[PDB]
């Protein structure tokens, strides 16, 4: 039935700031919460400030080098760092900014919290719209990421469950996750992301994993302009298929909001009510669920989008007309919740969806 919901949130996150020019504004997490808010959300769910996680809890993955570079670096005193930066891949993509170690421990925070909350059967699912930063390497930063709060959180679940599910539906790659748990089948990977000229360049559909994780690695390469009834056609029957033979004890969601329609830099072209129909998928199998947040550049759609899957994960109904808030001005200037696709042409043809889901089906049955 209806399940309860917790959900991880700082109130100094939306002040993070990437620098001029720079597409990730942590804002839209602010956005995101002031719109629930204004919706009554608060009232069915437990909120909680995340813990400012330690450098000794980020480097139960990450290297000791990076982490301590992390918590060193900042733009008064870049100049002594040019070789770490190289090194650790700090530039145009991941910048030094004022409190960037700060950002990566209430991201983190907020992950590995509702992770232990989960473990302890205080929750059904635990909300960190702040985390999702799939990109980032054991002792490497990339793609607007620094420290892997989701593995952190896949560790802290693999103390509890046997086998973790991780399903990402950002529009990139999820491939720091799917590298961190390459060479297990404690954790089965799938992700689902655009694939041909586009960062990060990996995830294949013969990406399927190594050694004892060889077909624990499951990717879904797709074209410019999918939509609702495409992605809604593959995703039940393939996240069915893997639910049925690898049998998770727990799930982790990576809702990366890039993946709709009319993305700064995204090419897809989903509603906030086809990216929602994902997480209601994933919710219909009643495993613990750890729900993150990931991409998402066109903001006011975003803040849509996350409040719409914060609804959807308590089971509430919520009215289309947006009720006043603190960023309304935004939303305009239709002042709707709903998002109505665009004209750009599906380059994935109704062959071609099904064609990669029976090679991904071919794969599953290599499980035991
Ligand atoms: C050396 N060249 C730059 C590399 C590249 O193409 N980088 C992507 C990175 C896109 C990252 C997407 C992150 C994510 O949405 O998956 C995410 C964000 C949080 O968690 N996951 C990118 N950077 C930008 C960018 C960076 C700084 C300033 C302006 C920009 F447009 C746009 N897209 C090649
Ligand atoms: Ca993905
Ligand atoms: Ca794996
Ligand atoms: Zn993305």
């Not at 994993?209 to 499951?218: H, I, M, S, T």
């Not at 893997?242 to 090419?267: F, K, T």
Request: neutral net charge; hydrophobic residues 35%; aromatic residues 12%.
């Amino acid at each position: 039935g209806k399940k309860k919901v917790c959900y991880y949130y700082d109130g100094d996150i939306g002040n993070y700031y990437y620098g001029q020019g720079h597409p990730m504004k942590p804002h839209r997490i602010r956005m995101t919460h002031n719109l629930l808010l204004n919706y009554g959300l608060y009232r069915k769910m437990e909120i909680y400030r995340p813990h400012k996680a330690t450098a000794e809890e980020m480097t139960k993955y990450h290297s000791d080098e990076y982490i301590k570079f992390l918590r060193s670096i900042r733009p008064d005193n870049m100049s002594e760092y040019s070789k770490q930066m190289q090194r650790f891949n700090v530039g145009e993509d991941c910048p030094v900014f004022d409190g960037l170690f700060e950002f990566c421990q209430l991201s983190t925070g907020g992950s590995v919290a509702g992770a232990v909350k989960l473990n302890r059967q205080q929750t059904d699912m635990a909300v960190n719209w702040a985390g999702g930063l799939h990109h980032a390497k054991k002792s490497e930063a990339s793609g607007f990421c620094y420290v892997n709060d989701i593995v952190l959180a896949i560790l802290e679940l693999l103390k509890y469950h046997q086998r973790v599910l991780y399903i990402d539906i950002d529009i990139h790659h999820g491939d720091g996750v799917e590298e961190a748990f390459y060479t297990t089948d404690r954790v089965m990977t799938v992700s689902f992301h655009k694939y041909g000229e586009y960062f990060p360049g990996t995830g294949d559909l013969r990406d399927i994993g190594a050694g004892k994780g060889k077909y624990y690695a499951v990717n879904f390469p797709m074209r410019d302009g999918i939509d609702d009834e495409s992605y809604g056609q593959i995703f039940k029957p393939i996240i069915s298929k893997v639910m049925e033979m690898y049998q998770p004890s727990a799930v982790v969601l990576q809702c990366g909001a890039d993946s709709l329609s009319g993305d700064r830099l995204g090419c897809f072209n989903l509603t906030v009510k086809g990216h929602a129909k994902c997480v209601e998928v994933v919710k219909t199998f009643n495993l613990p669920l750890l729900m993150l947040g990931g991409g998402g550049y066109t903001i006011r759609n975003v803040a849509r989008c996350w409040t719409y899957e914060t609804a959807v994960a308590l089971d509430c109904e919520i009215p289309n007309e947006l009720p006043y808030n603190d960023y309304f001005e935004y939303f305009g200037p239709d002042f709707k919740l709903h998002i109505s696709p665009s004209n750009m042409t599906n380059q994935n043809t109704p062959e071609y969806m099904e064609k990669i889901k029976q090679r991904l089906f071919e794969n599953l049955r290599m499980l035991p």
